[PDB]
Design a protein around this ligand. Structure first.
Ligand SMILES: O=C1CCN(c2cccc([N+](=O)[O-])c2)C(=O)N1
Ligand SMILES: O=C1CCN(c2cccc([N+](=O)[O-])c2)C(=O)N1
Ligand SMILES: O=C1CCN(c2cccc([N+](=O)[O-])c2)C(=O)N1
Ligand SMILES: [Mg+2]
Ligand SMILES: [Mg+2]
Lengths: 450, 450, 450
């Protein structure tokens, strides 16, 4: 049977105290609503109906590329009213799962189980057991099926001790949604049209409502403020870390590890404390990451060691390379196999060839460096004033003496040797030695002012 | 009714294994006793009587500016004896609250409630419920009021199961303190004069003793060693973080956030993991702080992003500025709006004008830099030998080529251009171009030793 | 009575998903099996019989220097079979303690207590109380002694509620081991020879089996995968941190502190969050370590402050020195008393004399620097091409101007002064002033392209 999703995301999120609407705040680097959209897609949803309202323009800009049907809800008259805005687009004989944009941790596995348990022409309701269920609607079962959701203020002493409560997440066919939504009223203290009332309406029609318990309480938790959001973040990171640990990644402390994207890994990977992995990251076999590193959108080959406090982005590092500590790889940094990048070195939009070393106090930008080069401490690639970031081309087996400035556009051919303290503006030929002639004044018997 | 405070702080703190006396060890960057003094001041205390003893000279130096009455207790003969040293200074018809210098987490709100509950000519006693009350004096209530504090060794089976215990924190009027303190004896296993005995003496005089429970167990906890102190630190930081989160500050992980002072914030502020905020810090709207940053006594304007592993102190940063990663702002660094400071850059006691950039491997000290300047990689401001840190003055729209040394005292006027590898000792005029004439030796066919 | 140990370490550790065998994965920087070997040595074990199998060659290379008897178990036919491989080497009247290489947290104190409780010709069995004992063999006591270990599948309702279970850790004399091991069969669902069966065999011979409870559940926990290993790591670090805190080390957050080796400390030492201590580290009195530092094999004198994000290895720092932030000490760095090393400075295999300062953007390698020297920002020690890392010798009271290159081999004698931007290739004499003669072209009225 086909499937489509409805995601409620119209909320202002007042207690976030933000200019953003509620569902755009991030978990693991990605909006809460994007998590739910992805999960909806994982389930094989044909359509995803996004009910939006507050911060409409921001929603549109932040989620511009998402494959969803944009359903504007001008007035927040209740969860049933929200879902009914998308109802005209429901296929009569597809299943519809209702999800909430502020509850990002809900898993595919739990939702697959919910959908499977849905009886024909009936409802599958996602429930959860709370140790303190105070305030939530209690699930009343009579011979396997949900006959009522009894609210806190209505429940008797016996019912108050029921720990199983309603989450509001549910599945039913499109025809049934269209039918029952038109029959939901707002005769209550809040004057709202509640999706909850579908359970009563289903029982009225002698249609079966089946309860399906969520395994994890936190999986169905929503975030109404940033304290709650921080709790979801930590639960999520702990779970990501646990999975990686069971896959054989050595994470020294999973409470001090953050993944904000996707990690692909080989075997015997070691990640020390306080590492942050962002975007799409790939690590080969036996990669070692030291404390305090940040990797965003990088590919790291086999047997690479990244030493502490290194920051890498949009970069590629070949096998057996050595990076850090205190190294900076900026976008377009491409390090070949067996290369070396050391402390207080910045590499931007440059390729560095096999075996080459750049180990101290150096800036290399917009450059091509060949194989087995020695880039001395203090070397800087620079431009003339008013230039448009021109390129420095360094061949193979070149020695560049310490504290030399390479002034682009310039080429240094294979086997060239450049002395310390040189200013290179003209191209250097193959096997050309360039050394600076210094003039110095020597004054003997100069007593220092001490 | 007026109020004054007495703070017991005479302890050696032997189990700290320190040359400091007990109450000078810090929580959130500030001595335990200073927390209590501040809380006493928040309550509107007219006088604060500080009972001190061990490490007297250190107490005097560390708390020199505190508005307290210094009451020296030469012998630690007990809590009642301690309080009686300050008693001659009690006003007969002011309230007196007794606090302990090693219990820094006690809140104003709890103490206001304690004072409010104090019956005329009676005592208000702060109590706390412990799940394991073993060792502590059990509170015995007979019709709403405290009739006895029964110690562990005296209590019967029934009383041993009482979970409410005595904290020793109490409020009574000055006249009553003077009266009852003179009647406290030391006939006990320890030979000490216990403040606890005031409850018995109050009941003797048919004066009412009212119990007031503390909401948080940790709020009344003292620290006798550094393990306990670390527990108070974490409880305190968690509470500070929680408050900020509910105020709308996005703290990615509140377990990896430290505030040691005061934070003023706008809306939509984002703070990544392992950030430390010290002294008085102010952040505008939409400030983003990356992982590993340290901010001490800084003002940060709207829309500033501070990238990872940046350390800033006694500095000001204008709106839309970009700092980091690996940036160092030392005291007196003043960055205007829309400025840029990059990796491995150190700025000390300098002003940098709007739009200017200092992006790599640079030291700027004792300088004024104007607007829209380009400070190249490797640039260093320096002095002659035996100088007294003289100033470098750089005007507006100046280009300083990479690896140039600026030798103070020197001025570079508006629109000047300085070539790479230059040593500037003489003033540079408006629209003056200064380039270094290099002499180089070129040797062709130099085969490298490889 | 003499003592020897047997350590079971033959396991593949399949669920680690590693090329290493199970017991070589590290806790606190050291293989799990090495922890157990050290503990065995602490007890005064005469021989340590290491039962190994999978990853034999890796075990041999990683533990090459360990004083153990290498006992190869070609087939893992069970714990009794494992121990019997070492049995021929047991002395008849020495005690033998059996330990597991994947359970590294077992303490000397617990094992001393186990051995003490061993009755003559009997067995001492280490047991532990679990809240959920499901799956583990229940200890059956009849008048003080263990009469049976009843497995999950055999136990009756009453026995299932027994919380005390078997750990497999046990002590008995060598003669008794030889006797009973020969009588262990493999008639069970797994077809394995279980060491557990010694308890039945002991009771058969009317020999006493005494239960000794472990105080900490985690102390006897093994790690079968990296998630479990991470849990052992955190328990271990928490325990190390707690001990240091009770000894008087101020650890700001013990959940963000890692010791991977041994720490020797004085009084009033302060360690901020996210510090890693590796190898053998010694800190004097009043040492302050700022956030993010890494210290590996270092000696730090009294009153040293190490500021944030400093990385030190195989180095010595004299009293009252100031290091950091962003300082790098590489192996062989020897800093005298009252020295200063600042941000973006790298010191390798060099000695730096009393009072000298190296405060910015500098590399010093293979050098000797005397007392009260001023090493300016941007200074770099370097070599000629094809050199073998020659030495730079700087005397006392030398001023080296900013951005100067020192080209080894070279000597600069006492009291010399070197101007900024100099290239030093020739030796500098006592009280010699060396300044660079720059040639510059000045072009007036150069309008920048803006
Ligand atoms: O009328 C309503 C009821 C509330 N609702 C809503 C329900 C749950 C979550 C969110 N949200 O994440 O913003 C919104 C809606 O979207 N519309
Ligand atoms: O005689 C005494 C009893 C103990 N006492 C005391 C009581 C509580 C806390 C501290 N302190 O924080 O140091 C001291 C005193 O100050 N004096
Ligand atoms: O036949 C056997 C039983 C299993 N065993 C074994 C038992 C416990 C722990 C380990 N280990 O840490 O690898 C191995 C062995 O060493 N041999
Ligand atoms: Mg330089
Ligand atoms: Mg230079």
């Amino acid at each position: 049977k086909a499937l489509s999703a409805v995601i409620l995301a119209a909320g202002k999120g007042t207690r976030m105290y933000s200019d953003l609407p509620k569902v755009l705040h991030t978990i693991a680097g990605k909006p809460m609503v994007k998590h739910v959209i992805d999960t909806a897609h994982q389930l094989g949803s044909e359509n995803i109906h996004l009910i939006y309202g507050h911060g409409g323009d921001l929603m549109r800009t932040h989620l511009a590329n998402e494959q969803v049907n944009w359903v504007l809800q001008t007035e927040q008259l209740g969860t049933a009213h929200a879902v009914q805005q998308a109802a005209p687009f429901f296929k009569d004989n597809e299943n519809i799962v209702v999800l909430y944009g502020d509850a990002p941790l809900i898993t595919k596995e739990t939702l697959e189980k919910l959908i499977e348990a849905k009886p024909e022409n009936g409802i599958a309701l996602l429930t959860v057991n709370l140790d303190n269920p105070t305030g939530y609607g209690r699930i009343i079962r009579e011979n396997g099926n949900v006959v009522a959701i009894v609210e806190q203020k209505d429940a008797n002493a016996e019912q108050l001790n029921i720990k199983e409560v309603n989450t509001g997440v549910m599945v039913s066919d499109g025809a049934s949604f269209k039918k029952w939504l038109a029959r939901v009223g707002n005769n209550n203290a809040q004057g709202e049209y509640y999706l909850t009332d579908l359970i009563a309406l289903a029982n009225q029609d002698n249609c079966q409502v089946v309860a399906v318990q969520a395994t994890d309480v936190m999986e169905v938790e929503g975030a109404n403020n940033r304290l709650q959001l921080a709790a979801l973040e930590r639960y999520f990171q702990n779970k990501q870390a646990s999975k990686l640990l069971l896959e054989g990644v050595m994470i020294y402390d999973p409470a001090r590890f953050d993944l904000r994207g996707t990690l692909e890994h080989g075997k015997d990977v070691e990640i020390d404390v306080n590492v942050i992995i962002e975007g799409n990251v790939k690590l080969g076999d036996r990669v070692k990451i030291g404390t305090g590193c940040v990797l965003k959108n990088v590919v790291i080959g086999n047997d690479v060691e990244i030493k502490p406090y290194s920051v890498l982005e949009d970069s590629i590092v070949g096998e057996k390379a050595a990076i850090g500590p205190f190294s900076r790889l900026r976008p377009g940094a491409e390090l070949a196999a067996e290369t070396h990048v050391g402390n207080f070195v910045e590499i931007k939009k440059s390729t560095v060839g096999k075996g080459s070393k750049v180990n101290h106090l150096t800036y290399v930008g917009d450059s091509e460096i060949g194989s087995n080069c020695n880039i001395g401490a203090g070397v800087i690639t620079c431009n003339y004033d008013g230039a448009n970031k021109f390129k420095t081309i360094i061949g193979d087996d070149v020695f560049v003496g310490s504290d030399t400035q390479l002034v682009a556009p310039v080429k240094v051919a294979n086997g060239a040797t450049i002395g310390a303290g040189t200013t290179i503006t003209r191209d250097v030929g193959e096997n050309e030695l360039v050394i600076t002639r210094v003039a110095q004044r020597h004054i003997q018997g100069w007593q220092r002012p001490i």
